[PDB]
Design a protein around this ligand. Structure first.
Ligand SMILES: *[C@@H]1O[C@H](CO)[C@@H](O[C@@H]2O[C@H](CO)[C@@H](O[C@@H]3O[C@H](CO[C@@H]4O[C@H](CO[C@H]5O[C@H](CO)[C@@H](O)[C@H](O)[C@@H]5O)[C@@H](O)[C@H](O[C@H]5O[C@H](CO)[C@@H](O)[C@H](O)[C@@H]5O)[C@@H]4O)[C@@H](O)[C@H](O[C@H]4O[C@H](CO)[C@@H](O)[C@H](O)[C@@H]4O[C@H]4O[C@H](CO)[C@@H](O)[C@H](O)[C@@H]4O)[C@@H]3O)[C@H](O)[C@H]2NC(C)=O)[C@H](O)[C@H]1NC(C)=O
Ligand SMILES: *[C@@H]1O[C@H](CO)[C@@H](O[C@@H]2O[C@H](CO)[C@@H](O[C@@H]3O[C@H](CO[C@H]4O[C@H](CO)[C@@H](O)[C@H](O)[C@@H]4O)[C@@H](O)[C@H](O[C@H]4O[C@H](CO)[C@@H](O)[C@H](O)[C@@H]4O[C@H]4O[C@H](CO)[C@@H](O)[C@H](O)[C@@H]4O)[C@@H]3O)[C@H](O)[C@H]2NC(C)=O)[C@H](O)[C@H]1NC(C)=O
Ligand SMILES: Cc1cc2nc3c(=O)[nH]c(=O)nc-3n(C[C@H](O)[C@H](O)[C@H](O)COP(=O)(O)OP(=O)(O)OC[C@H]3O[C@@H](n4cnc5c(N)ncnc54)[C@H](O)[C@@H]3O)c2cc1C
Ligand SMILES: Cc1cc2nc3c(=O)[nH]c(=O)nc-3n(C[C@H](O)[C@H](O)[C@H](O)COP(=O)(O)OP(=O)(O)OC[C@H]3O[C@@H](n4cnc5c(N)ncnc54)[C@H](O)[C@@H]3O)c2cc1C
Ligand SMILES: *[C@@H]1O[C@H](CO)[C@@H](O[C@@H]2O[C@H](CO)[C@@H](O)[C@H](O)[C@H]2NC(C)=O)[C@H](O)[C@H]1NC(C)=O
Ligand SMILES: *[C@@H]1O[C@H](CO)[C@@H](O[C@@H]2O[C@H](CO)[C@@H](O)[C@H](O)[C@H]2NC(C)=O)[C@H](O)[C@H]1NC(C)=O
Ligand SMILES: *[C@@H]1O[C@H](CO)[C@@H](O[C@@H]2O[C@H](CO)[C@@H](O)[C@H](O)[C@H]2NC(C)=O)[C@H](O)[C@H]1NC(C)=O
Ligand SMILES: *[C@@H]1O[C@H](CO)[C@@H](O[C@@H]2O[C@H](CO)[C@@H](O)[C@H](O)[C@H]2NC(C)=O)[C@H](O)[C@H]1NC(C)=O
Ligand SMILES: *[C@@H]1O[C@H](CO)[C@@H](O[C@@H]2O[C@H](CO)[C@@H](O)[C@H](O)[C@H]2NC(C)=O)[C@H](O)[C@H]1NC(C)=O
Ligand SMILES: *[C@@H]1O[C@H](CO)[C@@H](O)[C@H](O)[C@H]1NC(C)=O
Ligand SMILES: *[C@@H]1O[C@H](CO)[C@@H](O)[C@H](O)[C@H]1NC(C)=O
Ligand SMILES: *[C@@H]1O[C@H](CO)[C@@H](O)[C@H](O)[C@H]1NC(C)=O
Ligand SMILES: [Ba+2]
Ligand SMILES: [Ba+2]
Ligand SMILES: [Ba+2]
Ligand SMILES: [Ba+2]
Ligand SMILES: [Ba+2]
Ligand SMILES: [Ba+2]
Ligand SMILES: [Ba+2]
Ligand SMILES: [Ba+2]
Ligand SMILES: [Ba+2]
Ligand SMILES: [Ba+2]
Ligand SMILES: [Ba+2]
Ligand SMILES: [Ba+2]
Ligand SMILES: [Br-]
Ligand SMILES: [Br-]
Ligand SMILES: [Br-]
Ligand SMILES: [Cl-]
Ligand SMILES: [Cl-]
Ligand SMILES: [Cl-]
Ligand SMILES: [Cl-]
Ligand SMILES: [Cl-]
Ligand SMILES: [Cl-]
Ligand SMILES: [Cl-]
Ligand SMILES: [Cl-]
Ligand SMILES: [Cl-]
Ligand SMILES: [Cl-]
Ligand code: NA
Ligand code: NA
Ligand code: NA
Ligand code: NA
Ligand code: NA
Ligand code: NA
Lengths: 582, 581
């Protein structure tokens, strides 16, 4: 009778029962893991998701070109930040609410980071086995990519088959609306070539640099490949896979009768006073998203006493939950185009530090070479992190990425389809923020989410330089043929604005990038981490965090390719322990 | 207890029939539910999206915690369109739970100018909706307490003939127990120097000058939210049912007659798992001004130009969702000397000329010459459909200003350690809209556009009022306590002229969350949606009874009027019930 009829909506169907694994959150990592675990018919899984099934709704979900129309609806959590210090305004964090999580609402861009960035998760953040070669293999295993056709190659696509899986689960291929592709993509490529910048690198191969087109998470018929469509719809008839919709996981139930606390279940519901319990024989897996999974821990008594004590919550395990939050800032440059520029197409410039800063490179490098210690002390003073020595290790890692590997530092993302529009973000922010609960009741959803955008001076300078670069390249070389006047900033910022003018403009003309990671960072406890290299929360048995909370660093890429691989890798660790616990 | 009496399972009501269904358990919905169920033979089902919150603790029960609840599950936080004035989205605070926005509001208890309510009868053709009648219902709803000697010494003045003392809604002076700040009387002295009156009782029908006021709280200072006042005393009535946690999606219509009839509602939280419940007598929409019009549109009641592109058959064509009127608010904040310490709030209800000062000649010239152009422009933006009809509203406002000299702006003072003004133009000429953007009610995909500052007088008036708040903060007796401005502070030069304020204000304001008018109570020929008994035109058994229906803004805080509105509509409903038996 279809997937919808298989979904559970009544809490009484699971209340008081025991399953092998409970997954809080039916998003990208939650549904990937639920599918992987239920391949064994003897493993029972219950997914609890706050939203519902959305993959069949229609174009607002299924058409990637409708991106953004869903914002503000019931399928968007729209988490509100604190009043940001940079501009004394509240910001909204777009985040998908429904089966598939933010894969229901995202831009569909399918790229991978730089090899050195993933390698550092093992060599710097002490996560044995978390290196590019290992993670990339899981990524290719998840991937079901389609090579571009002659039309798509002619528009600018380049596909290196050795960097892609073709027999996996997540359908990926070129976006193709059916119309001609705009010549502006190739014009951007020519414009950066004039400056010695590479083009047409395959951004799945481990060196994202230059201007390239890329695959998207959609089927060949252009239907969005959201994680529910890819991982749940093919498998919903499995009797060992249960999915409860419309309910929030409030906290993890802990048993302290043993020598170490153990997660034995969860409480779920929609309002205080009408909750229900469900129990896990093996493990509870938190996958509610980087903004939520840390709060679930705090409501459970897992977090910093300085936070929990004033709220009346006993601290069962003291950990720096909710710190080390890393999101990027995004600004827009938009220009009208000539009729000859018409057509579809997206592309992105993954720009190095020196490409981003141009003639300011020397001054920017001087800051990078002298201020890391002071920046770390200040971020710690602002509550973004607790241990300055540990944070400095992160900053030195970023310096190594920039100076020794020349990784991409900013992304200039081009949309065409009738205009020339760049969304631009500094990929490697040095600011660190936090998320903390403000009340003991999980169902009040009263929390403080503060990414601390632009409170590090290099983040502001880098964003300003990258956005200025987007204006520059929009009217340089071959792009001049198609340029027909800037509309954003337009009248809001003089066209000849220098870098200092951009730095004054940017704090009042940016949005969150909604790429937040790090709130339950996977790194050693002594470095400020919350989970080990198998995603297990320190000091608690049978509890893991498996979502975007755990990446300890940002990366020069869009994260789906890594997060699918992440979930598969953690799933293998879960299954290994399951076999031992028999 | 009340919590155990509340329904949460849709199967408890699915497929059943009651006499009245009320969509929304907020201020007007719960007042009406209480009035209707006083007759034990009348059954009422309230369907509310939130739950019971009145016992949660200080975040709800302490008016001094105002604002802490924002962004939580008790705040709908409706997002606007990208506003044209600043290319930013704004958040509309709106209470989600039993009591609606009375759970989250500032508690201010004041009434408008007699001439404003009178115009509802003389300009907007609502027989019986005049000050004398509406105020009588307001006093009937009210249970006011006179100020004591400490509260009078701080600046309170209470005219007992303007207040009911045997009603339902507990109201009296806010009193935290601390000393009252001398700054309230300093503000009174500062405006006295300029010929402005003070200590008028803002409940008597002439809101003008600087006065203190009652708050909606009990003597022990617990918030008098509408659930505490109208539901908690009466929840044991078996004919009163309250379903929580569910959204009313649309009204079920029967076109079996010559005119459509409301026979029930569909409710739920997600497409594909909906439920029906039926009304023997009437469906009453009370989901708030941002929502009740969308429920009509989802039901096929609204403008074909909006409904047809979404695939919704227009059953009754009406200008639903137009005529949205909300105000803009800006802040001026200054530190105080230690001698200014203490509790206390006050408000300056300022006339047009008090607001504009030396710009009064300039502002009046605009008001006298551009009303027709402005009305055309608002209509072109989709805030209204009929320019001639909108011009009647504009001339009504002009009459209020020039002939009755009603208050045009409000400068609301908070102390308690600072001197902070929230300032808003009370009478915006801009008109906005709210329209659904999808056929699925449970997707909550809508376009809410108050069109802030898209009328040039609204921007000039806001700028002038906010500049006035800075001015009065450092004038006369207020100088004794001034210890430096913090907002705007460094963000706007302290000597800024009016033009500088007009460029600053679009980037430093918030919605006031007083939106009304989206189902305006006025003749169909004037663009109205409901008649003088709140009945939707062209539909039988359907009313809108909430903040959607006031056709104008008013120089006051609206609770006093909305409680009265609910009682008055309740009488009409019950008279029809009795006459039809
Ligand atoms: C976001 O919004 C926030 C506001 O919410 C905003 O932050 C405010 O910014 C404004 C500036 O616009 C700033 O206001 C100035 O404050 C000056 C006073 O310095 C402070 O003194 C305070 C009082 O000290 C006494 O009381 C306290 C408490 O009782 C005691 O602890 C003290 O011991 C003492 O007894 C202190 O509270 C305060 O410390 C705070 O700030 C520091 C930050 O460094 C922080 O570490 C600490 O924790 C505290 O929070 C600090 O010492 C005052 O001098 C300024 O007045 C000048 O300017 C105004 C405005 O133009 C004029 O009215 C005055 O007349 C005066 O003018 C003189 O200087 C002008 C130049 O500016 C010149 O033109 C003129 O001719 C004169 O020479 C001013 O009022 C305020 O303090 C900030 N913080 C707060 C909480 O309000 C923030 O910037 C916004 N961000 C964005 C991006 O927009
Ligand atoms: C909210 O955000 C919107 C955008 O989403 C924004 O509206 C846009 O504003 C910009 C200005 O900031 C507008 O762009 C300008 O448009 C005119 C052309 O407009 C006419 O013609 C077009 C078709 O050609 C029609 O569609 C339109 O309706 C009008 O009839 C151009 O003249 C402008 O270009 C000049 O300035 C640019 C930026 O500085 C230059 O790059 C360009 O070369 C031109 O520059 C200069 O030319 C000479 C060279 O020096 C010199 O004489 C002058 O310096 C001149 O500037 C510019 O592109 C845009 O149309 C608006 N609408 C849209 C949909 O984009 C809102 O303003 C914004 N609101 C707020 C409050 O921020
Ligand atoms: C606007 C936007 C655009 C993006 N664009 C791209 C792009 O172009 N390319 C790319 O690669 N990535 C993109 N992403 C990133 C990608 O979508 C996310 O990083 C990924 O979906 C995160 O997966 P996750 O499992 O950590 O969380 P999510 O996928 O967010 O899943 C978390 C789930 O938990 C649910 N939930 C929340 N609270 C609770 C609770 N208390 N109980 C139960 N369930 C709960 C949520 O409703 C959601 O279903 C974008 C993200 C956003 C927000
Ligand atoms: C921040 C703020 C401050 C205010 N301060 C003051 C003040 O100081 N003084 C004053 O007099 N007034 C004040 N008010 C105004 C007052 O609170 C409101 O005008 C009044 O509460 C409106 O009553 P209503 O019945 O129209 O709607 P509400 O009281 O908002 O009731 C609407 C109810 O419907 C529910 N609902 C929504 N959608 C649905 C649906 N689809 N199905 C079912 N239920 C639904 C809501 O959750 C809510 O309970 C303030 C308002 C706000 C927002
Ligand atoms: C980016 O520009 C910077 C600054 O101009 C260059 O940095 C210098 O590189 C030389 C050669 O390695 C070093 O000896 C200097 O100490 C560097 N200066 C600073 C301030 O760090 C850098 O070479 C450029 N990088 C690329 C890839 O072109
Ligand atoms: C702060 O973080 C640093 C870096 O992770 C920790 O320093 C390590 O401490 C252990 C145990 O004392 C030593 O064996 C290591 O040699 C230290 N490493 C470095 C690089 O200095 C430190 O323990 C943390 N301290 C606190 C209080 O959290
Ligand atoms: C408000 O101010 C207006 C404009 O300053 C006053 O009306 C003006 O009054 C003067 C003096 O009598 C006349 O010369 C002008 O022609 C009037 N102008 C207009 C446009 O009407 C008005 O009297 C003031 N109102 C109050 C109540 O003080
Ligand atoms: C537009 O609104 C105006 C104002 O209500 C309506 O104009 C009235 O039209 C009726 C019927 O033709 C006349 O009896 C009135 O005298 C008009 N009043 C005025 C003041 O001019 C007009 O009908 C409305 N248009 C629509 C389509 O309803
Ligand atoms: C605060 O406002 C008052 C009144 O608007 C200002 O004093 C006025 O100054 C103007 C300009 O010279 C004169 O037309 C008025 O007659 C003055 N009014 C009085 C009562 O004397 C005062 O200057 C303003 N304060 C600041 C700092 O701008
Ligand atoms: C394709 O990818 C493989 C693996 O990264 C690499 O060895 C090979 O040279 C690539 N081919 C091209 C043409 O870049
Ligand atoms: C952008 O152009 C300006 C003006 O030519 C130049 O000074 C600046 O360095 C450019 N930015 C970059 C990153 O190249
Ligand atoms: C109270 O207000 C009424 C109504 O406006 C008025 O007639 C009366 O004079 C006032 N009484 C006092 C004592 O101020
Ligand atoms: Ba490709
Ligand atoms: Ba396919
Ligand atoms: Ba370089
Ligand atoms: Ba095109
Ligand atoms: Ba609790
Ligand atoms: Ba991404
Ligand atoms: Ba009083
Ligand atoms: Ba007070
Ligand atoms: Ba006129
Ligand atoms: Ba539908
Ligand atoms: Ba009309
Ligand atoms: Ba009000
Ligand atoms: Br495209
Ligand atoms: Br009086
Ligand atoms: Br009392
Ligand atoms: Cl489908
Ligand atoms: Cl759709
Ligand atoms: Cl932006
Ligand atoms: Cl149900
Ligand atoms: Cl039924
Ligand atoms: Cl509380
Ligand atoms: Cl009564
Ligand atoms: Cl008195
Ligand atoms: Cl009873
Ligand atoms: Cl400004
Ligand atoms: Na450059
Ligand atoms: Na919110
Ligand atoms: Na308020
Ligand atoms: Na009375
Ligand atoms: Na106005
Ligand atoms: Na009417």
């Amino acid at each position: 009778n279809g997937i919808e009829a298989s979904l559970l909506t009544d809490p009484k169907d699971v209340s008081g029962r025991t399953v092998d694994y409970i997954i809080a959150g039916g998003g990208l990592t939650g549904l990937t893991t639920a599918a992987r675990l239920t391949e064994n018919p003897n493993i029972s899984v219950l997914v609890i998701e706050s939203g519902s099934y959305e993959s069949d709704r229609g174009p607002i979900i299924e058409d990637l070109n409708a991106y953004g129309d869903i914002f503000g609806s019931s399928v968007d959590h729209a988490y509100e930040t604190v009043e940001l210090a940079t501009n004394n305004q509240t910001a909204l964090i777009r985040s998908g609410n429904g089966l598939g999580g933010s894969t229901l609402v995202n831009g569909g861009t399918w790229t991978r980071p730089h090899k050195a960035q993933v390698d550092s998760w093992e060599t710097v953040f002490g996560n044995e086995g978390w290196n590019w070669d290992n993670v990339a293999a899981y990524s290719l295993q998840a991937e079901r990519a389609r090579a571009p056709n002659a039309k798509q190659i002619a528009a600018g696509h380049y596909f290196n088959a050795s960097c892609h899986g073709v027999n996996g689960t997540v359908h990926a291929g070129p976006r193709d609306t059916g119309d001609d592709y705009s010549p502006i993509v190739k014009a951007l490529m020519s414009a950066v070539e004039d400056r010695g910048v590479p083009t047409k690198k395959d951004f799945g191969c481990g060196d994202p640099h230059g201007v390239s087109m890329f695959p998207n998470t959609l089927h060949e018929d252009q239907v969005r490949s959201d994680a529910a469509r890819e991982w749940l719809l093919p498998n919903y008839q499995r009797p060992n896979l249960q999915v409860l919709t419309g309910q929030y996981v409030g906290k993890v139930l802990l048993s302290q009768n043993g020598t170490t606390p153990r997660a034995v279940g969860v409480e779920f519901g929609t309002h205080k006073g009408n909750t229900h319990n469900v129990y896990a024989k093996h493990e509870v897996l938190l996958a509610a998203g980087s903004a939520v999974s840390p709060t679930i821990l705090e409501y459970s008594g897992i977090g910093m006493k300085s936070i929990l004590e004033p709220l009346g919550i006993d601290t069962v395990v003291d950990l720096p939950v909710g710190l080390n939050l890393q999101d990027q800032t995004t600004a827009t440059v938009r220009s009208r185009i000539t009729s000859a520029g018409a057509g579809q197409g997206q592309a992105a410039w993954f720009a190095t530090f020196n490409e981003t800063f141009g003639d300011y490179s020397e001054k920017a490098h001087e800051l990078l070479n002298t201020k890391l210690e002071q920046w770390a002390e200040e971020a710690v003073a602002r509550g973004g992190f607790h241990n300055t020595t540990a944070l400095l290790i992160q900053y030195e890692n970023y310096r190594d990425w920039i100076v020794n590997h020349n990784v991409a530092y900013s992304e200039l993302f081009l949309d065409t389809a009738g205009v020339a529009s760049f969304d631009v973000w500094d990929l490697l922010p040095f600011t660190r923020g936090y998320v903390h609960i403000l009340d003991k009741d999980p169902y009040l959803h009263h929390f403080a989410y503060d990414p601390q955008y632009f409170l590090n001076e290099l983040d502001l300078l880098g964003q300003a330089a990258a956005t200025q670069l987007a204006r520059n390249i929009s009217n340089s070389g071959a792009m001049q043929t198609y340029f027909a006047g800037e509309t954003i900033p337009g009248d809001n910022l003089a066209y000849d604005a220098d870098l200092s003018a951009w730095t004054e403009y940017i704090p009042y003309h940016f949005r969150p990038n909604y790429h937040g990671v790090g709130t339950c960072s996977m790194m050693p406890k002594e470095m400020g981490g919350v989970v080990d290299n198998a995603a297990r929360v320190y000091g608690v048995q049978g509890l893991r965090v498996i979502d975007g909370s755990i990446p300890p660093t940002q990366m020069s890429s869009h994260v789906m390719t890594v997060f699918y691989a992440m979930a598969l890798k953690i799933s293998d660790a879960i299954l290994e322990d399951y076999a031992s616990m028999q």
